[PDB]
Amino acid sequence: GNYNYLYRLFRKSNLKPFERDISTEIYQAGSTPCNGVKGFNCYFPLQSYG
Amino acid sequence: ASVYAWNRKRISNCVADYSVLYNSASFSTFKCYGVSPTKLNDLCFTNVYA
């Protein structure tokens, strides 16, 4: 398994053309705020291809 | 019901509030495979099998 290539599964809004997002901030996927901490409906945005 | 005789409920002819179901913290697993959880309140379907 080569897991070195990652894609942004989760983001709040669509990018501009020729816009790059390398910010590794947490995403809030539910009503509960995450406060930078993983948990219920709190996921890392970058997931690797298997 | 048991899993060999799983109960099938047909959800139709009604308006469905998926935000209450999605914002509930009692659910330990909420995984969608064909749609988005944040677009359930925007899309329309003919009927739902539960």
mmCIF file of N, CA and C in Angstrom:
data_model
loop_
_atom_site.group_PDB
_atom_site.id
_atom_site.type_symbol
_atom_site.label_atom_id
_atom_site.label_comp_id
_atom_site.label_asym_id
_atom_site.label_seq_id
_atom_site.Cartn_x
_atom_site.Cartn_y
_atom_site.Cartn_z
ATOM 1 N N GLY A 1 0.780 -1.223 0.000
ATOM 2 C CA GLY A 1 0.000 0.000 0.000
ATOM 3 C C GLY A 1 0.814 1.277 0.000
ATOM 4 N N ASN A 2 0.690 2.073 -1.058
ATOM 5 C CA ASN A 2 1.377 3.359 -1.135
ATOM 6 C C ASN A 2 0.426 4.443 -0.643
ATOM 7 N N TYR A 3 0.660 4.929 0.576
ATOM 8 C CA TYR A 3 -0.226 5.892 1.215
ATOM 9 C C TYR A 3 0.370 7.295 1.228
ATOM 10 N N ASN A 4 1.361 7.553 0.377
ATOM 11 C CA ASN A 4 2.037 8.842 0.382
ATOM 12 C C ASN A 4 1.288 9.910 -0.406
ATOM 13 N N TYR A 5 0.275 9.534 -1.181
ATOM 14 C CA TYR A 5 -0.496 10.480 -1.975
ATOM 15 C C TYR A 5 -1.837 10.718 -1.293
ATOM 16 N N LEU A 6 -2.147 11.983 -1.021
ATOM 17 C CA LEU A 6 -3.299 12.347 -0.211
ATOM 18 C C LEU A 6 -4.172 13.332 -0.976
ATOM 19 N N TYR A 7 -5.478 13.271 -0.721
ATOM 20 C CA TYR A 7 -6.427 14.195 -1.320
ATOM 21 C C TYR A 7 -7.303 14.794 -0.228
ATOM 22 N N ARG A 8 -7.834 15.982 -0.504
ATOM 23 C CA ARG A 8 -8.662 16.693 0.467
ATOM 24 C C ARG A 8 -10.086 16.161 0.355
ATOM 25 N N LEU A 9 -10.456 15.265 1.272
ATOM 26 C CA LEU A 9 -11.811 14.724 1.291
ATOM 27 C C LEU A 9 -12.831 15.763 1.740
ATOM 28 N N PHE A 10 -12.458 16.621 2.687
ATOM 29 C CA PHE A 10 -13.402 17.507 3.355
ATOM 30 C C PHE A 10 -12.918 18.948 3.326
ATOM 31 N N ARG A 11 -13.801 19.847 2.894
ATOM 32 C CA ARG A 11 -13.565 21.282 2.932
ATOM 33 C C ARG A 11 -14.918 21.979 2.996
ATOM 34 N N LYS A 12 -14.907 23.214 3.503
ATOM 35 C CA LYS A 12 -16.145 23.964 3.678
ATOM 36 C C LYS A 12 -16.670 24.528 2.364
ATOM 37 N N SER A 13 -15.786 24.893 1.438
ATOM 38 C CA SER A 13 -16.213 25.561 0.218
ATOM 39 C C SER A 13 -15.305 25.153 -0.933
ATOM 40 N N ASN A 14 -15.816 25.336 -2.148
ATOM 41 C CA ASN A 14 -15.062 25.010 -3.350
ATOM 42 C C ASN A 14 -13.953 26.027 -3.592
ATOM 43 N N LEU A 15 -12.875 25.562 -4.219
ATOM 44 C CA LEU A 15 -11.717 26.409 -4.449
ATOM 45 C C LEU A 15 -11.970 27.375 -5.603
ATOM 46 N N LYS A 16 -11.133 28.406 -5.669
ATOM 47 C CA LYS A 16 -10.964 29.167 -6.892
ATOM 48 C C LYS A 16 -10.151 28.352 -7.899
ATOM 49 N N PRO A 17 -10.219 28.700 -9.186
ATOM 50 C CA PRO A 17 -9.249 28.151 -10.142
ATOM 51 C C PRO A 17 -7.823 28.563 -9.798
ATOM 52 N N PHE A 18 -6.900 27.601 -9.937
ATOM 53 C CA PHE A 18 -5.483 27.734 -9.556
ATOM 54 C C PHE A 18 -5.325 28.178 -8.103
ATOM 55 N N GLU A 19 -6.117 27.581 -7.216
ATOM 56 C CA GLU A 19 -6.014 27.827 -5.785
ATOM 57 C C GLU A 19 -5.528 26.561 -5.094
ATOM 58 N N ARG A 20 -4.555 26.712 -4.197
ATOM 59 C CA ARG A 20 -3.941 25.591 -3.496
ATOM 60 C C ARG A 20 -4.225 25.706 -2.007
ATOM 61 N N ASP A 21 -4.684 24.612 -1.408
ATOM 62 C CA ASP A 21 -4.969 24.571 0.020
ATOM 63 C C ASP A 21 -4.072 23.509 0.643
ATOM 64 N N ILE A 22 -3.097 23.954 1.434
ATOM 65 C CA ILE A 22 -2.218 23.069 2.188
ATOM 66 C C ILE A 22 -2.441 23.195 3.689
ATOM 67 N N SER A 23 -3.504 23.876 4.109
ATOM 68 C CA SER A 23 -3.721 24.147 5.525
ATOM 69 C C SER A 23 -4.257 22.892 6.201
ATOM 70 N N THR A 24 -3.543 22.401 7.211
ATOM 71 C CA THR A 24 -3.953 21.186 7.918
ATOM 72 C C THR A 24 -4.745 21.526 9.180
ATOM 73 N N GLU A 25 -5.824 22.276 8.991
ATOM 74 C CA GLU A 25 -6.758 22.594 10.060
ATOM 75 C C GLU A 25 -7.926 21.615 10.036
ATOM 76 N N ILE A 26 -8.513 21.382 11.212
ATOM 77 C CA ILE A 26 -9.549 20.362 11.334
ATOM 78 C C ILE A 26 -10.848 20.877 10.712
ATOM 79 N N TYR A 27 -11.703 19.942 10.314
ATOM 80 C CA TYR A 27 -12.982 20.261 9.703
ATOM 81 C C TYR A 27 -14.091 19.916 10.684
ATOM 82 N N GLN A 28 -15.137 20.738 10.690
ATOM 83 C CA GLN A 28 -16.334 20.504 11.496
ATOM 84 C C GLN A 28 -17.410 19.929 10.579
ATOM 85 N N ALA A 29 -17.630 18.618 10.667
ATOM 86 C CA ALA A 29 -18.616 17.941 9.833
ATOM 87 C C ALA A 29 -19.977 17.791 10.497
ATOM 88 N N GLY A 30 -20.151 18.283 11.718
ATOM 89 C CA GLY A 30 -21.431 18.189 12.390
ATOM 90 C C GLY A 30 -21.826 19.493 13.047
ATOM 91 N N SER A 31 -22.845 19.459 13.910
ATOM 92 C CA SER A 31 -23.240 20.660 14.638
ATOM 93 C C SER A 31 -22.281 20.975 15.777
ATOM 94 N N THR A 32 -21.637 19.959 16.340
ATOM 95 C CA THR A 32 -20.747 20.155 17.479
ATOM 96 C C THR A 32 -19.423 20.746 17.006
ATOM 97 N N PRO A 33 -18.965 21.850 17.599
ATOM 98 C CA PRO A 33 -17.637 22.378 17.260
ATOM 99 C C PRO A 33 -16.526 21.439 17.701
ATOM 100 N N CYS A 34 -15.421 21.475 16.957
ATOM 101 C CA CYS A 34 -14.344 20.512 17.151
ATOM 102 C C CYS A 34 -13.196 21.057 17.987
ATOM 103 N N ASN A 35 -12.964 22.377 17.923
ATOM 104 C CA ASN A 35 -11.919 23.095 18.671
ATOM 105 C C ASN A 35 -10.523 22.534 18.403
ATOM 106 N N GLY A 36 -10.268 22.145 17.155
ATOM 107 C CA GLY A 36 -8.979 21.593 16.793
ATOM 108 C C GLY A 36 -8.739 20.173 17.248
ATOM 109 N N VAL A 37 -9.771 19.475 17.722
ATOM 110 C CA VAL A 37 -9.641 18.148 18.311
ATOM 111 C C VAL A 37 -10.551 17.198 17.542
ATOM 112 N N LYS A 38 -10.018 16.037 17.166
ATOM 113 C CA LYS A 38 -10.817 15.011 16.514
ATOM 114 C C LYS A 38 -11.835 14.421 17.488
ATOM 115 N N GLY A 39 -12.917 13.891 16.927
ATOM 116 C CA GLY A 39 -14.002 13.373 17.746
ATOM 117 C C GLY A 39 -15.183 12.975 16.891
ATOM 118 N N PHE A 40 -16.375 13.104 17.472
ATOM 119 C CA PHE A 40 -17.606 12.834 16.740
ATOM 120 C C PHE A 40 -17.833 13.917 15.693
ATOM 121 N N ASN A 41 -17.918 13.487 14.426
ATOM 122 C CA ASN A 41 -18.030 14.346 13.239
ATOM 123 C C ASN A 41 -16.888 15.357 13.142
ATOM 124 N N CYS A 42 -15.692 14.974 13.589
ATOM 125 C CA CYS A 42 -14.498 15.803 13.455
ATOM 126 C C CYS A 42 -13.418 14.977 12.771
ATOM 127 N N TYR A 43 -13.129 15.291 11.511
ATOM 128 C CA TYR A 43 -12.268 14.458 10.687
ATOM 129 C C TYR A 43 -11.116 15.287 10.136
ATOM 130 N N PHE A 44 -9.970 14.633 9.956
ATOM 131 C CA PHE A 44 -8.866 15.246 9.231
ATOM 132 C C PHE A 44 -9.244 15.417 7.761
ATOM 133 N N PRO A 45 -8.934 16.568 7.154
ATOM 134 C CA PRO A 45 -9.335 16.785 5.755
ATOM 135 C C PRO A 45 -8.538 15.969 4.751
ATOM 136 N N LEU A 46 -7.322 15.547 5.087
ATOM 137 C CA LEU A 46 -6.430 14.892 4.139
ATOM 138 C C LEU A 46 -6.442 13.391 4.392
ATOM 139 N N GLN A 47 -6.924 12.631 3.413
ATOM 140 C CA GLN A 47 -6.932 11.179 3.475
ATOM 141 C C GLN A 47 -6.166 10.609 2.290
ATOM 142 N N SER A 48 -5.524 9.470 2.514
ATOM 143 C CA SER A 48 -4.575 8.916 1.563
ATOM 144 C C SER A 48 -5.265 7.909 0.648
ATOM 145 N N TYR A 49 -4.808 7.854 -0.601
ATOM 146 C CA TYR A 49 -5.218 6.777 -1.489
ATOM 147 C C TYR A 49 -4.556 5.469 -1.074
ATOM 148 N N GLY A 50 -5.333 4.390 -1.096
ATOM 149 C CA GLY A 50 -4.816 3.062 -0.830
ATOM 150 C C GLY A 50 -4.386 2.306 -2.070
ATOM 151 N N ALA B 1 -36.079 -5.707 14.696
ATOM 152 C CA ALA B 1 -36.113 -7.019 14.073
ATOM 153 C C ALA B 1 -34.719 -7.638 14.016
ATOM 154 N N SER B 2 -34.685 -8.923 13.671
ATOM 155 C CA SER B 2 -33.441 -9.636 13.433
ATOM 156 C C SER B 2 -32.900 -9.287 12.047
ATOM 157 N N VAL B 3 -31.679 -9.738 11.766
ATOM 158 C CA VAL B 3 -31.022 -9.351 10.522
ATOM 159 C C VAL B 3 -31.404 -10.250 9.344
ATOM 160 N N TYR B 4 -31.840 -11.488 9.591
ATOM 161 C CA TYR B 4 -32.347 -12.296 8.488
ATOM 162 C C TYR B 4 -33.760 -11.894 8.083
ATOM 163 N N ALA B 5 -34.474 -11.183 8.951
ATOM 164 C CA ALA B 5 -35.830 -10.704 8.701
ATOM 165 C C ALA B 5 -35.927 -9.218 9.014
ATOM 166 N N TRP B 6 -35.003 -8.440 8.443
ATOM 167 C CA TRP B 6 -34.920 -7.004 8.697
ATOM 168 C C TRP B 6 -36.184 -6.277 8.255
ATOM 169 N N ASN B 7 -36.649 -5.361 9.100
ATOM 170 C CA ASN B 7 -37.891 -4.652 8.833
ATOM 171 C C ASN B 7 -37.622 -3.542 7.829
ATOM 172 N N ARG B 8 -38.438 -3.489 6.782
ATOM 173 C CA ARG B 8 -38.314 -2.488 5.731
ATOM 174 C C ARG B 8 -39.482 -1.520 5.838
ATOM 175 N N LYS B 9 -39.173 -0.262 6.133
ATOM 176 C CA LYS B 9 -40.170 0.793 6.207
ATOM 177 C C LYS B 9 -40.010 1.714 5.009
ATOM 178 N N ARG B 10 -41.121 1.980 4.337
ATOM 179 C CA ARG B 10 -41.159 2.823 3.151
ATOM 180 C C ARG B 10 -41.523 4.247 3.550
ATOM 181 N N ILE B 11 -40.587 5.167 3.360
ATOM 182 C CA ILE B 11 -40.780 6.575 3.685
ATOM 183 C C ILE B 11 -41.158 7.280 2.388
ATOM 184 N N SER B 12 -42.393 7.772 2.308
ATOM 185 C CA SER B 12 -42.879 8.429 1.101
ATOM 186 C C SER B 12 -44.033 9.352 1.460
ATOM 187 N N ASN B 13 -44.304 10.293 0.543
ATOM 188 C CA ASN B 13 -45.391 11.280 0.635
ATOM 189 C C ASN B 13 -45.296 12.118 1.911
ATOM 190 N N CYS B 14 -44.086 12.570 2.224
ATOM 191 C CA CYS B 14 -43.835 13.355 3.425
ATOM 192 C C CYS B 14 -42.557 14.155 3.222
ATOM 193 N N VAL B 15 -42.356 15.144 4.091
ATOM 194 C CA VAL B 15 -41.137 15.943 4.097
ATOM 195 C C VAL B 15 -40.243 15.448 5.232
ATOM 196 N N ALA B 16 -38.966 15.242 4.926
ATOM 197 C CA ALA B 16 -38.044 14.578 5.836
ATOM 198 C C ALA B 16 -36.993 15.553 6.342
ATOM 199 N N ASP B 17 -36.864 15.645 7.662
ATOM 200 C CA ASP B 17 -35.903 16.540 8.301
ATOM 201 C C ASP B 17 -34.699 15.683 8.682
ATOM 202 N N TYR B 18 -33.710 15.622 7.788
ATOM 203 C CA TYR B 18 -32.503 14.860 8.072
ATOM 204 C C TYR B 18 -31.533 15.603 8.977
ATOM 205 N N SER B 19 -31.750 16.900 9.220
ATOM 206 C CA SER B 19 -30.843 17.653 10.082
ATOM 207 C C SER B 19 -30.956 17.213 11.537
ATOM 208 N N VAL B 20 -32.165 16.865 11.986
ATOM 209 C CA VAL B 20 -32.337 16.351 13.342
ATOM 210 C C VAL B 20 -31.669 14.988 13.494
ATOM 211 N N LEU B 21 -31.791 14.138 12.474
ATOM 212 C CA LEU B 21 -31.138 12.833 12.492
ATOM 213 C C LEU B 21 -29.619 12.954 12.437
ATOM 214 N N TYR B 22 -29.110 13.898 11.649
ATOM 215 C CA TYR B 22 -27.670 14.069 11.500
ATOM 216 C C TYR B 22 -27.020 14.762 12.691
ATOM 217 N N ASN B 23 -27.723 15.683 13.344
ATOM 218 C CA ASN B 23 -27.162 16.410 14.474
ATOM 219 C C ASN B 23 -27.258 15.631 15.779
ATOM 220 N N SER B 24 -27.903 14.466 15.765
ATOM 221 C CA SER B 24 -28.013 13.638 16.956
ATOM 222 C C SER B 24 -26.667 12.979 17.236
ATOM 223 N N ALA B 25 -26.214 13.076 18.482
ATOM 224 C CA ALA B 25 -24.926 12.538 18.899
ATOM 225 C C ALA B 25 -25.007 11.105 19.404
ATOM 226 N N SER B 26 -26.204 10.514 19.452
ATOM 227 C CA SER B 26 -26.335 9.143 19.926
ATOM 228 C C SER B 26 -25.830 8.131 18.906
ATOM 229 N N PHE B 27 -25.783 8.499 17.628
ATOM 230 C CA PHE B 27 -25.400 7.571 16.570
ATOM 231 C C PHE B 27 -23.883 7.428 16.535
ATOM 232 N N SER B 28 -23.405 6.191 16.661
ATOM 233 C CA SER B 28 -21.980 5.902 16.619
ATOM 234 C C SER B 28 -21.444 5.731 15.205
ATOM 235 N N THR B 29 -22.316 5.630 14.205
ATOM 236 C CA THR B 29 -21.871 5.473 12.825
ATOM 237 C C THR B 29 -22.883 6.160 11.920
ATOM 238 N N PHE B 30 -22.406 7.103 11.106
ATOM 239 C CA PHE B 30 -23.234 7.820 10.131
ATOM 240 C C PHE B 30 -22.376 7.912 8.870
ATOM 241 N N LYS B 31 -22.501 6.914 7.998
ATOM 242 C CA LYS B 31 -21.667 6.801 6.809
ATOM 243 C C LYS B 31 -22.551 6.709 5.576
ATOM 244 N N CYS B 32 -22.389 7.655 4.657
ATOM 245 C CA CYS B 32 -23.127 7.649 3.405
ATOM 246 C C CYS B 32 -22.217 7.190 2.274
ATOM 247 N N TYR B 33 -22.810 6.514 1.289
ATOM 248 C CA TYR B 33 -22.045 5.940 0.195
ATOM 249 C C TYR B 33 -22.474 6.413 -1.186
ATOM 250 N N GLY B 34 -23.563 7.169 -1.299
ATOM 251 C CA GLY B 34 -23.985 7.677 -2.590
ATOM 252 C C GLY B 34 -24.365 9.142 -2.613
ATOM 253 N N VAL B 35 -24.513 9.746 -1.436
ATOM 254 C CA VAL B 35 -24.933 11.132 -1.292
ATOM 255 C C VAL B 35 -24.040 11.817 -0.263
ATOM 256 N N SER B 36 -24.344 13.089 0.002
ATOM 257 C CA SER B 36 -23.653 13.867 1.013
ATOM 258 C C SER B 36 -24.572 14.125 2.200
ATOM 259 N N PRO B 37 -24.040 14.074 3.427
ATOM 260 C CA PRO B 37 -24.886 14.320 4.609
ATOM 261 C C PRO B 37 -25.413 15.742 4.704
ATOM 262 N N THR B 38 -24.658 16.731 4.228
ATOM 263 C CA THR B 38 -25.085 18.122 4.300
ATOM 264 C C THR B 38 -26.025 18.511 3.167
ATOM 265 N N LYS B 39 -26.207 17.644 2.172
ATOM 266 C CA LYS B 39 -27.108 17.899 1.057
ATOM 267 C C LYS B 39 -28.362 17.036 1.114
ATOM 268 N N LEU B 40 -28.595 16.339 2.230
ATOM 269 C CA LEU B 40 -29.827 15.571 2.387
ATOM 270 C C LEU B 40 -31.043 16.475 2.536
ATOM 271 N N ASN B 41 -30.871 17.657 3.128
ATOM 272 C CA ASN B 41 -31.966 18.605 3.274
ATOM 273 C C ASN B 41 -32.236 19.398 2.004
ATOM 274 N N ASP B 42 -31.384 19.270 0.988
ATOM 275 C CA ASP B 42 -31.552 19.984 -0.271
ATOM 276 C C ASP B 42 -32.057 19.099 -1.402
ATOM 277 N N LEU B 43 -31.660 17.831 -1.431
ATOM 278 C CA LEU B 43 -32.056 16.937 -2.507
ATOM 279 C C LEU B 43 -33.462 16.391 -2.275
ATOM 280 N N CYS B 44 -34.047 15.865 -3.348
ATOM 281 C CA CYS B 44 -35.377 15.277 -3.323
ATOM 282 C C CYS B 44 -35.322 13.879 -3.921
ATOM 283 N N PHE B 45 -36.077 12.958 -3.326
ATOM 284 C CA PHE B 45 -36.108 11.568 -3.755
ATOM 285 C C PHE B 45 -37.554 11.101 -3.850
ATOM 286 N N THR B 46 -37.769 10.046 -4.643
ATOM 287 C CA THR B 46 -39.120 9.528 -4.832
ATOM 288 C C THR B 46 -39.630 8.845 -3.567
ATOM 289 N N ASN B 47 -38.829 7.949 -2.996
ATOM 290 C CA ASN B 47 -39.179 7.267 -1.758
ATOM 291 C C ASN B 47 -37.898 6.808 -1.080
ATOM 292 N N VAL B 48 -38.011 6.505 0.211
ATOM 293 C CA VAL B 48 -36.887 6.053 1.021
ATOM 294 C C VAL B 48 -37.263 4.704 1.621
ATOM 295 N N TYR B 49 -36.368 3.728 1.493
ATOM 296 C CA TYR B 49 -36.500 2.440 2.161
ATOM 297 C C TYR B 49 -35.607 2.420 3.395
ATOM 298 N N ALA B 50 -36.211 2.212 4.560
ATOM 299 C CA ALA B 50 -35.492 2.173 5.828
ATOM 300 C C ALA B 50 -35.428 0.722 6.286
#
